[PDB]
Write a protein that binds this ligand. Structure first.
Ligand SMILES: O=C(CCCC[C@@H]1SC[C@@H]2NC(=O)N[C@@H]21)NCCN(Cc1ccccn1)Cc1ccccn1
Ligand SMILES: O=C(CCCC[C@@H]1SC[C@@H]2NC(=O)N[C@@H]21)NCCN(Cc1ccccn1)Cc1ccccn1
Ligand SMILES: O=C(CCCC[C@@H]1SC[C@@H]2NC(=O)N[C@@H]21)NCCN(Cc1ccccn1)Cc1ccccn1
Ligand SMILES: O=C(CCCC[C@@H]1SC[C@@H]2NC(=O)N[C@@H]21)NCCN(Cc1ccccn1)Cc1ccccn1
Lengths: 124, 124, 124, 124
């Protein structure tokens, strides 16, 4: 993938969370996520996909991933998806928006889903 | 997983798209997505995660998945993530919200991301 | 406004909430909202804007409005915005997505905002 | 309103857009918006609402507003809603997420709505 080497590695967001990812040649993202906030401790499995053949016109590389917030320690009965783009270079970034859905009853489903935004960098 | 059997199989949304998924015992979702709309043809790889040990209080099962819109036919330089919950029973559903990010220049990144909602059923 | 007469009046969503609105000739929306769910009772002031000169090509009419969830009875320290389009005709609809933000501390601001979707009709 | 004086005035976001607002004693927001990007020129009317009696526990003040992108110069057949919170003090901010809906045909309504996030400050 064009940005396989750029994406692969450890990333940090503005909350102090850690995103460890391997980008595969056929568009796969695999790794682990550790949130600094919320009903979470230690690492969670993540999986996702990226554009392995992005535009050559200076555009970012589209990607997304999912974490279900269950591991051996805790289960928050919730999943987050991040959708965004990798922007390579000296100060590389992944700029994302996310959707965090919890399991609800039907009566409470209107209130099932948080939205927010995370910016990941290779330092901090 | 509690809902492994319920989630696994073929799903259809209100647009006429087809979602084919296998739920794994350790929380994995793998399969293929075919959109009835947009800059897409044929099937795309998807991966994601679900809560394999949901609450037993009548709540839904939280899940999410990603599709990067590149296959052997087309590349839309974009990725969609779906975040939502599975609601089992006679008229099973997956109720989702989604984020579709395209690769953009920095100047156009404000306009990188669509949001919407899909409801999947086992018929239609 | 082209759709002034179509928008003006009483609307109901899938939750059983009631949206009472007057569309003005210069693009204003004014009225009251009563939620069937959440930390809400009775009516709340709403204000917003619509496109008073929409495209004549069969497109919908873009609009949005805000409710801050404070009235004489309760204060939920939160605001919802609805963004969507009016689609006129025998089975008129307003199709919306919404953002509901509560006041939070800085440490909890990641979790400040719910997202969802409401469909309003002139019956039910 | 507790934060009437803090909110009232001129605000700037990270795109270079300008938000001019008056906060009323009964929760109203009125003013004008000028976007630095997109299909927009000069000022547009905005209206919205804020929590005029926020929590006294260090939480932000919830608010939202709408702009329909029609003025005497241009009509983008679209509306944006911002939902967020005011955080007062030496480096006051309004932290928002937004939904921008354009009028579409029914076939294209899946793609009607952009999502993003704006941070407003009293300088820049
Ligand atoms: O806490 C979790 C798991 C960890 C999420 C951390 C997120 S992922 C996005 C962001 N980026 C990060 O690095 N960390 C955070 N899920 C429960 C979320 N709950 C609310 C919540 C709110 C405040 C504090 C703790 N929890 C319950 C709930 C879900 C849905 C709707 C309404 N309510
Ligand atoms: O079309 C695609 C790939 C297929 C997406 C189909 C979606 S996924 C969610 C929904 N559920 C489905 O089953 N199908 C659809 N990506 C380009 C999206 N573009 C816009 C678009 C708008 C209208 C028609 C076609 N394309 C460019 C663009 C992306 C971001 C921001 C702004 N603009
Ligand atoms: O309840 C309210 C006011 C009424 C909102 C009703 C909404 S508006 C959209 C939808 N359409 C309708 O007709 N009714 C509903 N605000 C507090 C929301 N809270 C959560 C909540 C969740 C479940 C039940 C009650 N409250 C606290 C909170 C806000 C943000 C983030 C995280 N958490
Ligand atoms: O451009 C406008 C009006 C101005 C919006 C400026 C926004 S408001 C949020 C953000 N904050 C700001 O200060 N400025 C920006 N509406 C058309 C948006 N269009 C896309 C667009 C994309 C790139 C460049 C210009 N336009 C068409 C369209 C709407 C919906 C879905 C899919 N596509």
């Amino acid at each position: 993938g064009r940005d396989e080497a750029g994406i692969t590695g450890t990333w940090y967001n503005q909350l102090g969370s850690t995103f460890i990812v391997t980008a595969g040649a056929d568009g796969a993202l695999t790794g682990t996520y550790e949130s600094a906030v919320g009903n979470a401790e230690s690492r969670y499995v993540l999986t996702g996909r990226y554009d392995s053949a992005p535009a050559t016109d200076g555009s970012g590389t589209a990607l997304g991933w999912t974490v279900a917030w269950k591991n051996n320690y805790r289960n928050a009965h919730s999943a987050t998806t991040w959708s965004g783009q990798y922007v390579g270079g000296a100060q590389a970034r992944i700029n994302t928006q996310w959707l965090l859905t919890e399991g609800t009853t039907e009566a409470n489903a209107w209130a099932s889903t948080l939205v927010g935004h995370d910016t990941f960098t290779k330092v901090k």
